[PDB]
PDB file of C-alpha atoms and ligand atoms in Angstrom:
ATOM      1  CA  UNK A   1      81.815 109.509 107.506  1.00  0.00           C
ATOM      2  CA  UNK A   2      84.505 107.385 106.984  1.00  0.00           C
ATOM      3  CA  UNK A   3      85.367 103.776 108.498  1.00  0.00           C
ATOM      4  CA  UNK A   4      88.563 103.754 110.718  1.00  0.00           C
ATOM      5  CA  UNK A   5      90.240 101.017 112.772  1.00  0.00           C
ATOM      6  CA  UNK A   6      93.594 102.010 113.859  1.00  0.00           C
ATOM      7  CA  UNK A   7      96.507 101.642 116.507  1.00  0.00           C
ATOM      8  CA  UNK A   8      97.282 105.101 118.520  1.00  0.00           C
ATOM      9  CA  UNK A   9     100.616 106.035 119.869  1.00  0.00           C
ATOM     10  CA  UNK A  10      98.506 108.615 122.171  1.00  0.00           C
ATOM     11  CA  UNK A  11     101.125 111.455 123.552  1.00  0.00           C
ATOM     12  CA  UNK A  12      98.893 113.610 125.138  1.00  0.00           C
ATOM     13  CA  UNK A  13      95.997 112.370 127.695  1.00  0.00           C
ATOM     14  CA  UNK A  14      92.647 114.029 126.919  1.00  0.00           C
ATOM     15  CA  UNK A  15      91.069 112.769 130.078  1.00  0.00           C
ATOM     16  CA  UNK A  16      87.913 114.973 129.259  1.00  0.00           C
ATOM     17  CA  UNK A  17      87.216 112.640 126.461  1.00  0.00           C
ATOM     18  CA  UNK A  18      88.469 108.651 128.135  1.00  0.00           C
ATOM     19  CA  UNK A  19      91.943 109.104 127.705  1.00  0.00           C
ATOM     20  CA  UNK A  20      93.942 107.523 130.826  1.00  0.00           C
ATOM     21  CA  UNK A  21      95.965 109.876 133.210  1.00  0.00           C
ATOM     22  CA  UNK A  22      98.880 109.270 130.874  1.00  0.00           C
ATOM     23  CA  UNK A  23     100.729 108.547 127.545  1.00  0.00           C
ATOM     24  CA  UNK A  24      99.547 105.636 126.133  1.00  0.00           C
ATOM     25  CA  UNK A  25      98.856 103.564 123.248  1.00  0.00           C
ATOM     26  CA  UNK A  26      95.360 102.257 121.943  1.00  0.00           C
ATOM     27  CA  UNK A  27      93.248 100.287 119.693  1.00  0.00           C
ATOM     28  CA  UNK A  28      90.850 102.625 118.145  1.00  0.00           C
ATOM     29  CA  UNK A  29      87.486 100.548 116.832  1.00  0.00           C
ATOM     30  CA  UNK A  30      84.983 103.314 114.757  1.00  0.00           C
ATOM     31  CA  UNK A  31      85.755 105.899 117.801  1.00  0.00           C
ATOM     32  CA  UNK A  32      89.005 108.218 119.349  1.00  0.00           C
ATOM     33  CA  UNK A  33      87.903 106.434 122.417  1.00  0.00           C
ATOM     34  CA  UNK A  34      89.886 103.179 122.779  1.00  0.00           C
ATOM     35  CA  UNK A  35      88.572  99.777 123.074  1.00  0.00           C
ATOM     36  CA  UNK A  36      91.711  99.390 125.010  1.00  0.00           C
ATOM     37  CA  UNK A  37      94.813 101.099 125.929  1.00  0.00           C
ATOM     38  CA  UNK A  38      98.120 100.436 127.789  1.00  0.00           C
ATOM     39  CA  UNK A  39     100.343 103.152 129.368  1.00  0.00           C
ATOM     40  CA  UNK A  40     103.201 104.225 127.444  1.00  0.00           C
ATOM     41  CA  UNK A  41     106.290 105.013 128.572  1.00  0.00           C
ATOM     42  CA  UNK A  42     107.006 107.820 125.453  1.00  0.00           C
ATOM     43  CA  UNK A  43     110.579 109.004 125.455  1.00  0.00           C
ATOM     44  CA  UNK A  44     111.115 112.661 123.838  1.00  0.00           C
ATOM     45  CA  UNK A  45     113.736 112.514 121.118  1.00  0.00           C
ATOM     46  CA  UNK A  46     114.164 109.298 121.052  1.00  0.00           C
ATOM     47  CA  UNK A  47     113.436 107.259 118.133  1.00  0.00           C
ATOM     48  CA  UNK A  48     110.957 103.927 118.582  1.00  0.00           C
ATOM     49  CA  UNK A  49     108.961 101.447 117.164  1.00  0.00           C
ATOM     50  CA  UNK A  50     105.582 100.617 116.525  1.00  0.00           C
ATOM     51  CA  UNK A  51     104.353  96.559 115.589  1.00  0.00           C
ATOM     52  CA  UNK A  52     101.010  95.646 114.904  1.00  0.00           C
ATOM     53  CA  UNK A  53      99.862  92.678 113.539  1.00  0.00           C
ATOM     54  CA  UNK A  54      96.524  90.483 113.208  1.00  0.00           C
ATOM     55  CA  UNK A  55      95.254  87.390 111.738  1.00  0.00           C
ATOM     56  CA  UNK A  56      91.635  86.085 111.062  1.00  0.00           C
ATOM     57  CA  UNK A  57      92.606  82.716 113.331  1.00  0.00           C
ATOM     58  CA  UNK A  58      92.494  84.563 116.042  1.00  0.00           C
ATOM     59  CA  UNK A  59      90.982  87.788 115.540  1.00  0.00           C
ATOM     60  CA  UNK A  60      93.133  89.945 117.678  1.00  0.00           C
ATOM     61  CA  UNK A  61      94.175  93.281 117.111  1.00  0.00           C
ATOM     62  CA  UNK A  62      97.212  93.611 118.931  1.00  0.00           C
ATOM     63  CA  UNK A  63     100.066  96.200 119.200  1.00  0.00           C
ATOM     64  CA  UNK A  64     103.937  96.759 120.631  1.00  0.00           C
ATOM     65  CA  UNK A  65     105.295 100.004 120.809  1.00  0.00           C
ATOM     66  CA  UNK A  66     108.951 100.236 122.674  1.00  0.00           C
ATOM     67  CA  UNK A  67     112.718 101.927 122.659  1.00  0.00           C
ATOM     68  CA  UNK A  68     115.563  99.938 122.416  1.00  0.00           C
ATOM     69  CA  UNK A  69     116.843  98.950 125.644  1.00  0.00           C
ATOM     70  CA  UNK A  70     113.324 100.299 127.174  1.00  0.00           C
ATOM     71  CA  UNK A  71     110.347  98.038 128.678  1.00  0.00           C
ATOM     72  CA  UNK A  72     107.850  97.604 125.336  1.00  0.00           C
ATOM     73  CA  UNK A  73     103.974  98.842 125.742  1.00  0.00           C
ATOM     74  CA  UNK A  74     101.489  95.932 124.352  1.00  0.00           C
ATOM     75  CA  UNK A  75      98.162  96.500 123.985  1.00  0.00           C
ATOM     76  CA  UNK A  76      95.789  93.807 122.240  1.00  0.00           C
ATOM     77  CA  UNK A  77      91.608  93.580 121.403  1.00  0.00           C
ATOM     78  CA  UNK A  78      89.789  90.830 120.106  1.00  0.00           C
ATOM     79  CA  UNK A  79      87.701  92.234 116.957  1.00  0.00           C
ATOM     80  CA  UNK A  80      86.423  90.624 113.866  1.00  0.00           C
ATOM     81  CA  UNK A  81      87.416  93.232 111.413  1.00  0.00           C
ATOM     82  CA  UNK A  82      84.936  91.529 109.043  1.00  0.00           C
ATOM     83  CA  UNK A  83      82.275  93.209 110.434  1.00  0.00           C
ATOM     84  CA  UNK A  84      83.897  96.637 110.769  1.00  0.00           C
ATOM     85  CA  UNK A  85      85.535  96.964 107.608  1.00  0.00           C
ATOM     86  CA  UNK A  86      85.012  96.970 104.117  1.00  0.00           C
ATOM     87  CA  UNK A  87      86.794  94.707 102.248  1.00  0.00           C
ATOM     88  CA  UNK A  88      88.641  96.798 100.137  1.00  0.00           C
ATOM     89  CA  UNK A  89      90.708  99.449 102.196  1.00  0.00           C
ATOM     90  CA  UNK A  90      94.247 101.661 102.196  1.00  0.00           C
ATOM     91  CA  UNK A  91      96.624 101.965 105.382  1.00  0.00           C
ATOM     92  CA  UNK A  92      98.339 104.809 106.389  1.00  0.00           C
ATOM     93  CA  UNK A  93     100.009 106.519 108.980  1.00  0.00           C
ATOM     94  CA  UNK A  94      98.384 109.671 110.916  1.00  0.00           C
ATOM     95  CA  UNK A  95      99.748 112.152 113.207  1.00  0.00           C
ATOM     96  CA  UNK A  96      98.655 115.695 114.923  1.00  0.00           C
ATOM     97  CA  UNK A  97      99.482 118.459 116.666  1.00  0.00           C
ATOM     98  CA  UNK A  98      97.479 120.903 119.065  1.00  0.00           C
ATOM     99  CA  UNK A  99      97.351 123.369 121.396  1.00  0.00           C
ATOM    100  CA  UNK A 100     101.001 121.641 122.868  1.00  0.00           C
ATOM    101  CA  UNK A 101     103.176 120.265 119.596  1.00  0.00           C
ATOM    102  CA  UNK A 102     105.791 117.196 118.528  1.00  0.00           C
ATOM    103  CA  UNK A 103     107.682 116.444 115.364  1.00  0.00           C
ATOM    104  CA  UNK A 104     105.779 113.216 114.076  1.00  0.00           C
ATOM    105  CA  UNK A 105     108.381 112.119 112.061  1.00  0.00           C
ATOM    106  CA  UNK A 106     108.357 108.493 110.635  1.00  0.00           C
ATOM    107  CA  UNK A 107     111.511 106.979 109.327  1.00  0.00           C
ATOM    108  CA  UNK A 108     110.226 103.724 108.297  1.00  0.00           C
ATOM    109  CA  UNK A 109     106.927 101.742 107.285  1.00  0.00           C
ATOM    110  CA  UNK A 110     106.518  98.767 106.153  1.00  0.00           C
ATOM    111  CA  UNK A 111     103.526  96.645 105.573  1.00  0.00           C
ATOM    112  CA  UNK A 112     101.944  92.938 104.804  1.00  0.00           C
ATOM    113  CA  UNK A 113      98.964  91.323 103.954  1.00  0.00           C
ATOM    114  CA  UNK A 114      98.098  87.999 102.983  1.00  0.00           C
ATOM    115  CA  UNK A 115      94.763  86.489 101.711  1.00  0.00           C
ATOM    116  CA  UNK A 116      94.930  82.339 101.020  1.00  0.00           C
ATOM    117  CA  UNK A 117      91.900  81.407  98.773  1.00  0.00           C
ATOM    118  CA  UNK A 118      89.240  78.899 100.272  1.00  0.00           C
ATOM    119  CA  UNK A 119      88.751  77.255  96.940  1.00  0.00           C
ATOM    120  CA  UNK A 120      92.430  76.918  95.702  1.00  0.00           C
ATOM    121  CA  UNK A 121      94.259  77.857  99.358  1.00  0.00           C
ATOM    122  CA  UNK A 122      96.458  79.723  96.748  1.00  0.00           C
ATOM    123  CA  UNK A 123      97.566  83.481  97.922  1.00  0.00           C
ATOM    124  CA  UNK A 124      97.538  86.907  96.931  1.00  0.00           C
ATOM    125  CA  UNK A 125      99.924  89.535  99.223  1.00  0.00           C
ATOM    126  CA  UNK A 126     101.071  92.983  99.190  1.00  0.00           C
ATOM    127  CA  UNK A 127     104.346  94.131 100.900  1.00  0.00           C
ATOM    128  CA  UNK A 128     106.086  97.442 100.940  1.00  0.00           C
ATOM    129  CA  UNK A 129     108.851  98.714 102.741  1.00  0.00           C
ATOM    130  CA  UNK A 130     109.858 102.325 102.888  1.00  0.00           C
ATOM    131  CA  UNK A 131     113.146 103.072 104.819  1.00  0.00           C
ATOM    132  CA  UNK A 132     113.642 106.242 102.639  1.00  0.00           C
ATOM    133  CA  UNK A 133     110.715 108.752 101.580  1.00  0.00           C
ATOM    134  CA  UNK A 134     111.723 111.104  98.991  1.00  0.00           C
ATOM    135  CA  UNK A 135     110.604 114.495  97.839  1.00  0.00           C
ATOM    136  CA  UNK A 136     108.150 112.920  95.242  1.00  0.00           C
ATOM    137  CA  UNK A 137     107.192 109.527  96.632  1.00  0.00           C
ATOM    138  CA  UNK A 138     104.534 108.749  93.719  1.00  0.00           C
ATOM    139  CA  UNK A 139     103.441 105.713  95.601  1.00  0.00           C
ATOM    140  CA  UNK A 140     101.927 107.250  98.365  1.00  0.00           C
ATOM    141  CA  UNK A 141      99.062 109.532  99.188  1.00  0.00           C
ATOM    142  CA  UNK A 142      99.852 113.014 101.174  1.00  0.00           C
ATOM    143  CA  UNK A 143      97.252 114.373 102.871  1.00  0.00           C
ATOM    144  CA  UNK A 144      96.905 117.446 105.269  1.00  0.00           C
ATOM    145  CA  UNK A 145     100.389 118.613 106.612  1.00  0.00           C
ATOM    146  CA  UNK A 146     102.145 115.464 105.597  1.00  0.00           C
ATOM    147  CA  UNK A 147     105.469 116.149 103.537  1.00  0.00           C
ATOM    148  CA  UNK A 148     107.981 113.335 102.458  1.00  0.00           C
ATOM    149  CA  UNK A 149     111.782 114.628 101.303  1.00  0.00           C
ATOM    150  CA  UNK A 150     113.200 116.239 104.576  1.00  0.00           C
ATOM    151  CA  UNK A 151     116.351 114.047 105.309  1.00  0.00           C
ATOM    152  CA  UNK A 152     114.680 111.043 103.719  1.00  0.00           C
ATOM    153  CA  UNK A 153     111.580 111.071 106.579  1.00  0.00           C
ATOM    154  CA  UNK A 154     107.996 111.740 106.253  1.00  0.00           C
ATOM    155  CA  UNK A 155     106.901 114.323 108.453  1.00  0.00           C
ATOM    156  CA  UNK A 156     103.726 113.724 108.998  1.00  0.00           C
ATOM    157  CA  UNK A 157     102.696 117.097 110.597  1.00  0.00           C
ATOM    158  CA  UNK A 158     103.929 120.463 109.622  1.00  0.00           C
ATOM    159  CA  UNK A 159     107.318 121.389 110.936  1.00  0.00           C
ATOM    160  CA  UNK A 160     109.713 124.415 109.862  1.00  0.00           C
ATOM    161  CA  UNK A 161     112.996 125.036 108.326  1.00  0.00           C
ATOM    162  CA  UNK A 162     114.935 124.246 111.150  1.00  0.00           C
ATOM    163  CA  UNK A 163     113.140 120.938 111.928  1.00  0.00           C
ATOM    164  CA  UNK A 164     110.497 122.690 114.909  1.00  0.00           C
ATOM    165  CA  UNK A 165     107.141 120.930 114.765  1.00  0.00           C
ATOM    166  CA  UNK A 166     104.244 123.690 114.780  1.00  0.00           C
ATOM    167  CA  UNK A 167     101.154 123.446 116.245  1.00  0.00           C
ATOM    168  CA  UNK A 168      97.294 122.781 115.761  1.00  0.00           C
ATOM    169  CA  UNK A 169      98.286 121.223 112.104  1.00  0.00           C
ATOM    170  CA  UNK A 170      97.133 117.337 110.584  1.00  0.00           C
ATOM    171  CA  UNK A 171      98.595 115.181 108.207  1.00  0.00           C
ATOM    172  CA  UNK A 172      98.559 111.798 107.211  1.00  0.00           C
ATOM    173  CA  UNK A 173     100.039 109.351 104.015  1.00  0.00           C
ATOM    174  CA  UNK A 174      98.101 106.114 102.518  1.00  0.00           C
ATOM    175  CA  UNK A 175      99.316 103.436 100.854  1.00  0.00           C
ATOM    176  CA  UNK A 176      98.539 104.183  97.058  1.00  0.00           C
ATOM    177  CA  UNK A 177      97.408 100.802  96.297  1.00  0.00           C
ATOM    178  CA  UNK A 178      94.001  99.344  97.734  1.00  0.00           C
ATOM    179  CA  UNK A 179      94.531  96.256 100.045  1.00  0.00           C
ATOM    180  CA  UNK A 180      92.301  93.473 100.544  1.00  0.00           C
ATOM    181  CA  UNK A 181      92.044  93.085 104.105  1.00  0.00           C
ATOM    182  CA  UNK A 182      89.394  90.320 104.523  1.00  0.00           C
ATOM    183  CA  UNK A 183      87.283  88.202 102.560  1.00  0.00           C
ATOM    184  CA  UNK A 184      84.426  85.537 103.241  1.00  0.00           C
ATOM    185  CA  UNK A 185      85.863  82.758 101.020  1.00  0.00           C
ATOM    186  CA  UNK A 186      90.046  83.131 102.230  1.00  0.00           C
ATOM    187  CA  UNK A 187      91.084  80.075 104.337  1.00  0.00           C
ATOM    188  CA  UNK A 188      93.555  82.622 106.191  1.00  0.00           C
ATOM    189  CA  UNK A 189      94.355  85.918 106.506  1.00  0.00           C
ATOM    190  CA  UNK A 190      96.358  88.030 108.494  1.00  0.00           C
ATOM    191  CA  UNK A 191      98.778  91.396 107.981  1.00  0.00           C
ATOM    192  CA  UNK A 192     101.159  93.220 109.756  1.00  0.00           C
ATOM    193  CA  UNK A 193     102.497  96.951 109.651  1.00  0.00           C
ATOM    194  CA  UNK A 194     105.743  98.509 111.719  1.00  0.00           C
ATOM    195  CA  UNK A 195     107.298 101.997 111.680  1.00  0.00           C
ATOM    196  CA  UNK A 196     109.643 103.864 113.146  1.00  0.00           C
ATOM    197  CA  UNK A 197     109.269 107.175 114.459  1.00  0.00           C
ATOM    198  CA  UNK A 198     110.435 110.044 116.186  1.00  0.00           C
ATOM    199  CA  UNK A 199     108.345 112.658 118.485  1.00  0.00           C
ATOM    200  CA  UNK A 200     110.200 115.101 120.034  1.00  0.00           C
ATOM    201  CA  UNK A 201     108.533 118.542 121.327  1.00  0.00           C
ATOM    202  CA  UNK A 202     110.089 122.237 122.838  1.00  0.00           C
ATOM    203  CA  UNK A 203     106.635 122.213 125.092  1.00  0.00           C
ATOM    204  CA  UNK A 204     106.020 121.534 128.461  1.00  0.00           C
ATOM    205  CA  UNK A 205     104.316 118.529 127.306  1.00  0.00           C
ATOM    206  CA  UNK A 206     104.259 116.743 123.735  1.00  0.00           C
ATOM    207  CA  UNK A 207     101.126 116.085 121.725  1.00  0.00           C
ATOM    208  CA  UNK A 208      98.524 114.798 120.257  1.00  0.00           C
ATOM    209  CA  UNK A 209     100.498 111.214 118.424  1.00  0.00           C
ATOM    210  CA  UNK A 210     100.557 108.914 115.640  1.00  0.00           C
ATOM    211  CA  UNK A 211      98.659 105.999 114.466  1.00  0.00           C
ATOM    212  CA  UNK A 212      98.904 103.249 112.041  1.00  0.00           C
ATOM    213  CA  UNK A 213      95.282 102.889 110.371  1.00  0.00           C
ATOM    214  CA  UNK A 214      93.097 101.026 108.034  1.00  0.00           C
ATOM    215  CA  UNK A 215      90.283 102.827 106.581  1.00  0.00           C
ATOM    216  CA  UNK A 216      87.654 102.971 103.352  1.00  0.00           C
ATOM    217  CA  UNK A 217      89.650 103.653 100.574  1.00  0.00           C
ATOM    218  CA  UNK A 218      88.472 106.833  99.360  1.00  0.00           C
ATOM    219  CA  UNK A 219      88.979 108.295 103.593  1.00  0.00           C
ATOM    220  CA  UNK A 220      89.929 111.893 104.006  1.00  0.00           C
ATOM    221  CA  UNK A 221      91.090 114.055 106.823  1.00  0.00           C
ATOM    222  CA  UNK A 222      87.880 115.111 108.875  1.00  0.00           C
ATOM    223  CA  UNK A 223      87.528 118.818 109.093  1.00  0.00           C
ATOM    224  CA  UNK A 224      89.078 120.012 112.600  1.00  0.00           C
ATOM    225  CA  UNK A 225      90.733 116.569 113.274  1.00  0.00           C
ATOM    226  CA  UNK A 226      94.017 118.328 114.563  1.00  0.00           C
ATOM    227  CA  UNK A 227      95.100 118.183 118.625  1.00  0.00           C
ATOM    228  CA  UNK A 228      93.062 114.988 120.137  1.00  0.00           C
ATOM    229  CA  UNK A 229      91.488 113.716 117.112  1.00  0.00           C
ATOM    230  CA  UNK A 230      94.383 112.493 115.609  1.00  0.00           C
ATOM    231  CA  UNK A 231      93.510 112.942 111.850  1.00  0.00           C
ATOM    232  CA  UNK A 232      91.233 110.083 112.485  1.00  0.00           C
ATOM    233  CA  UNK A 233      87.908 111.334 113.694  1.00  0.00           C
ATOM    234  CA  UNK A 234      85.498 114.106 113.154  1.00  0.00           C
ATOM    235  CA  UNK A 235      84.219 114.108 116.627  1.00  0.00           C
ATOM    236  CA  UNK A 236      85.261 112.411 119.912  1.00  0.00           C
ATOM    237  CA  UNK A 237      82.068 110.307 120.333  1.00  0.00           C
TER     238      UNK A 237
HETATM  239 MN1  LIG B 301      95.092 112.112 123.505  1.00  0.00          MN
HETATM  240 MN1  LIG B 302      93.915 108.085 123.501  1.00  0.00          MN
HETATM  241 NA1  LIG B 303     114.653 105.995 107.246  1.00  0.00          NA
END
């Protein structure tokens, strides 16, 4: 299976499976079931934004999700990524749908990562901002659901022609390029990702979120991964 570490914006609480009595955001470690989470005041139809960041000083995975003019959610973990990841990996964004729906629609990501050699302390980096997605956006990988064009946004799960989400569907786009996220011999590394996005749902209730997430390079969407899941697990264990 594959390797994920990611950063859910949670919608919908699946208490069954550990999810707290409410919307919420979380640090996913190798499992659906957060290391930690922090309630999240989710506003339908309005749009937001997501901040994650982490360094190999500290070793903290931490996250801020907020509206403008709203309290921010934080949520942070100490985790040595080291020994979770592989040292090669892509990023991406994720998002699902379920038996209750929302439009998962991202209008901006941008991300950067810096390695700073042991031997030289010289650095390599990647950085890539996307404010616009278009129709054929050749640097990133679609998978599932995911469709880029629509008003310049990448919806990440299906939605029809007049912009209603649909249920039970998954979809998620990586970063083309591989990114060095760690190394043994780097002095100092760290990167950073933020997007914007907008869930809004017809239902009683929205689900199932987004997340921001790192994983092995050559990661798929696991089979059935729509609703709770998230596009990032095959099972909630
Ligand atoms: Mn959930
Ligand atoms: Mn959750
Ligand atoms: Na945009």
């Amino acid at each position: 299976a594959d390797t994920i570490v990611a950063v859910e914006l949670d919608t919908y609480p699946n208490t069954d499976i550990g999810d707290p009595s409410y919307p919420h955001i979380g640090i996913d470690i190798k499992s659906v079931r957060s290391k930690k989470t922090a309630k999240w005041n989710m506003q339908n139809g309005k749009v937001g934004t997501a901040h994650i960041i982490y360094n190999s000083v500290d070793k903290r995975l931490s996250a801020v999700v907020s509206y403008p003019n709203a309290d921010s959610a934080t949520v942070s973990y100490d985790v040595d990524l080291d020994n979770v990841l592989p040292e090669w990996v892509r990023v991406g964004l994720s998002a699902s749908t379920g038996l209750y729906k929302e439009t998962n629609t991202i209008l901006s990501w941008s991300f950067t990562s810096k390695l700073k050699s042991n031997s030289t302390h010289e650095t390599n980096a990647l950085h890539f901002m996307f404010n616009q997605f278009s129709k054929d956006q050749k640097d990133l990988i679609l998978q599932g659901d995911a469709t880029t064009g629509t008003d310049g946004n990448l919806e990440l799960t299906r939605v029809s022609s007049n912009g209603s989400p649909q249920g039970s569907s998954v979809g998620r786009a990586l970063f083309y390029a591989p990114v060095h996220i760690w190394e043994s011999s780097a002095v100092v590394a760290s990167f950073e990702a933020t997007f914007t996005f907008l869930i809004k749902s017809p239902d009683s209730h929205p689900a199932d979120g987004i997340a921001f997430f790192i994983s092995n390079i050559d990661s798929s969407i696991p089979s059935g991964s729509t609703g709770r899941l998230l596009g990032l697990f095959p099972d909630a264990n």
